[PDB]
Amino acid sequence: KPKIMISSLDAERLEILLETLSFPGRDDLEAELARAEVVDPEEIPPTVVTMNSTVRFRVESSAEEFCLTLVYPKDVDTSGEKISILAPVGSALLGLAQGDEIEWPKPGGGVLRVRIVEVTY
Amino acid sequence: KPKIMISSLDAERLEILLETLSQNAFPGRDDLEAELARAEVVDPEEIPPTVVTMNSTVRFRVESSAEEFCLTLVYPKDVDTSGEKISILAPVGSALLGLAQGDEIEWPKPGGGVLRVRIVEVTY
């Protein structure tokens, strides 16, 4: 499996956050962090999903797009734009890259299938 | 096909919420609106205890490990930093409303794969 790329600071901060818990994805997230490429932030391409980045998604079956900003738990907003690293979906976004696909439950039934089209700060 | 059931209170609050956030194109909004528009609006009393409503706590079992965990479906005002609340606006959260005990859903596993869970209990 490819390894995720993450800054030293985000690795440290996440390790500590995860250490203090007790979510379903905790162990899987920890396993990614354990084998990650921990580098200077400037070494991580802007196509990689990092903590505090904004991810633009396109629904594969249409032109439709939306954004989510991946954040630490205290930084989540109340208007549908931010998503916690501890949240379902949020925990899986970390270290994905532009072009990657992801899917999750669609309200009312079925699966929302999306592709990452851009990552920004 | 099958309409979900909501209380009058929750139908009303969600409608005002969605009106207030008119410009916020969150994932699955169109689908949640559609589901709300055709929902059957009942008194809280004849929505069964096994149906997920706003402020319900949902207990889940993961199929691979039989670990269990909970999420409480809340309005934006009530999410906290614990990881146990989930907004009606959030991925997964928006799909929980109207589901019932026994229903299965799945979402991404960090590093790849799916976490598939069954709703083991609903509590208000």
Q: Tokens for B17?
A: 């919420």
Could you tell me the sign of the dihedral formed by the alpha carbons of A27, A13, A99, B34, in that order? positive
- Taking alpha carbons only, the member of B113, B61, B64 closest to residue A31 is B113
What CATH architecture is B1-42? Orthogonal Bundle (1.10)
Method: X-ray
For residue B43, give how far its alpha carbon lies from the nearest alpha carbon of chain A (Å).
21
d(CA A9, CA A11): 5
CATH class of the domain at A1-39? mainly alpha
CATH number, domain B43-124, options 3.40.50.2000, 3.10.50.30, 3.30.1330.10, 3.40.47.10: 3.10.50.30
Which helix or strand (DSSP H or E) is residue A5 part of? strand A5-7
Number of CB atoms found within 10 A of residue A23's CB:
22
CATH architecture of A40-121: Roll (3.10)
CA distances from B87 to A81, B37, B99 (A): 11, 19, 15
Q: How far is A37 from chain B (nearest CA, A)?
A: 14
- Among residues B27, B18, B28, B93, the alpha carbon closest in space to that of A67 is found at B27
Looking at the partner chain, which of A1, A23, A103 has a beta carbon nearest the beta carbon of B83? A23
- Report resolution in angstroms: 1.7
Q: Report the distance separating Cα B87 and Cα A53, nearest Å.
A: 20
Q: Which residues pair with A115 in a beta bridge?
A: A58, A101
For every residue of chain B, which 3-state class applies, written as one string? CCCCEEEHHHHHHHHHHHHHCCCCCCCCHHHHHHHHHCCEEECHHHCCCCECCCCCEEEEEECCCCCEEEEEEECHHHCCCCCCEEECCCCCHHHHCCCECCCEEEEECCCCCEEEEEEEEEEC
The answer, for A33 touching chain B at a CB cutoff of 8 Å, is: no
Phi, then psi, of B24 in degrees rounded to 5: -90, 100
Q: Which residues of B touch A74 (CB under 8 A)?
A: 81
Structural domain spans, chain B: 1-42, 43-124
Mutate: best of A22, A30, A104, partner B, most B CBs <10 A: A104
Residues of A whose CB is below 8 A from B115: 24-25, 88
In the structure encoding, which two tokens stand for residue B12, read together?
């009303």
Sequence-ordered strand ranges (E) for A8-99: 37-39, 54-59, 65-71, 82-84
